[PDB]
Design a binder for this molecule. Structure first.
Ligand SMILES: O=c1oc2cc(O)c(O)cc2c2cc(O)c(O)cc12
Ligand SMILES: [Zn+2]
Length: 350
């Protein structure tokens, strides 16, 4: 459809002017890292080795950045919480970060408090940089920095574990018929991350594989040279852009009906990875079949909404569409709206 290409062109024109705000983001992040190194608890803090200071959770908000700070720690031991498959208490192999211990458990609350305090005091020194209260997110992102009242950056703290991935990830990352089993082995040799998120609960941590997700998106083809020359231009990243934008537009349209609050771009990204697994051939993502491919993604996301099943791509026992996480009527609301847009040629794209 031409409307899809027009939407993509709008998104690219919106993206070209960032190369100036990205420098500001890099400066502020570098400053806060050099500050956090001075603390006795955060000596090994840094940015995820993702080749970018930042990511973008929202494609329709080029002003909202998302950075993640990793903290290399002594050998970590993990305990599962209530068979959640994703949430864990952290212990230390043996006796630095000792100040944040609450018994045998590493306190997420205490560490986040010191993190935020260090932020507040080091941002009072900067210029046009205000800290705001976004603790309604359940510890992650930890902070939400504000520059010139037009730049918003969410900062999430993450613990790096160079151990083997937890057992819940054993049947995840099913990229064997798509990106090969060698690549899956290589990726699972990389470390994993733990972010402070609660379940009621007040001291749990959740698994994070944003680096692996970024690696997959930027190396997404069966052919190693996908999207490296003009003869192999597939439309996977364009379909993902279309899915993110559809969700963002629907969430902005119905921001006053609290039925689309708990949906995020992580859901469409998870579904999209599953569709990639289902459609492993690059020929199934020809740049000429953009409409058909996007329609495959939309219909698969609808299937996940109706059946209330959206497995985490790395932890398949974690149902992101769990009745414990999102109510059935909210899923049904999103299903109706997506069916409406699909039956009416997506009026949100006009
Ligand atoms: O790493 C993320 O993991 C998740 C896991 C979940 O189960 C979930 O429901 C949401 C997320 C999620 C949502 C975001 O907006 C984001 O920027 C990152 C993540
Ligand atoms: Zn490609």
């Amino acid at each position: 459809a031409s409307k899809l290409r027009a939407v993509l062109e709008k998104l690219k024109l919106s993206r070209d002017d960032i190369s100036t705000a990205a420098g500001m983001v890099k400066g502020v992040v570098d400053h806060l890292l050099l500050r956090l190194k001075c603390d006795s608890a955060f000596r090994g803090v840094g940015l995820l080795n993702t080749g970018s200071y930042y990511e973008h959770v929202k494609i329709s908000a080029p002003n909202e950045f998302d950075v993640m700070f990793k903290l290399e720690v002594p050998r970590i031991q993990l305990e599962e919480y209530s068979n959640t498959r994703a949430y864990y208490f952290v212990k230390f192999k043996r006796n630095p970060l000792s100040q944040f211990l609450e018994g045998e458990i590493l306190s997420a609350s205490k560490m986040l408090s010191k993190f935020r305090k260090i932020i507040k005091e080091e941002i009072n020194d900067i210029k046009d940089t205000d800290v705001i209260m976004k603790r309604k997110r359940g510890g992650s992102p930890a902070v939400t920095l504000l520059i010139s009242e037009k730049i918003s950056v969410d900062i999430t703290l993450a613990l790096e574990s160079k151990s083997s991935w937890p057992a819940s990830t054993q049947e995840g990352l099913r990229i064997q018929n798509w990106l090969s089993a060698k690549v899956r082995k290589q990726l699972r040799l990389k470390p994993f991350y733990l972010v402070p998120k609660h379940a009621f609960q007040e001291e749990t941590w959740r698994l994070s594989f944003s680096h692996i997700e970024k690696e997959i998106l930027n190396n997404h083809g069966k052919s190693k040279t996908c999207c490296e020359n003009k003869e192999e231009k597939c439309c996977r990243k364009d379909c993902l852009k279309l899915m993110k934008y559809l969700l963002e537009q629907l969430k902005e349209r119905f921001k006053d009906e609290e039925h689309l609050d708990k949906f995020s771009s992580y859901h469409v990204k998870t579904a999209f990875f599953h569709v990639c697994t289902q459609n492993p051939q690059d020929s199934q993502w020809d740049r000429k079949d953009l409409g058909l491919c996007f329609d495959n993604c939309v219909t698969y996301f609808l299937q996940c909404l109706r059946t209330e099943k959206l497995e985490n791509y790395f932890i398949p026992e974690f149902n992101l569409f769990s009745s414990n996480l999102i109510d059935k009527r909210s899923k049904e609301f999103l299903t109706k709206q997506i069916e409406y847009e699909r039956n009416n040629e997506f009026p949100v794209f006009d």
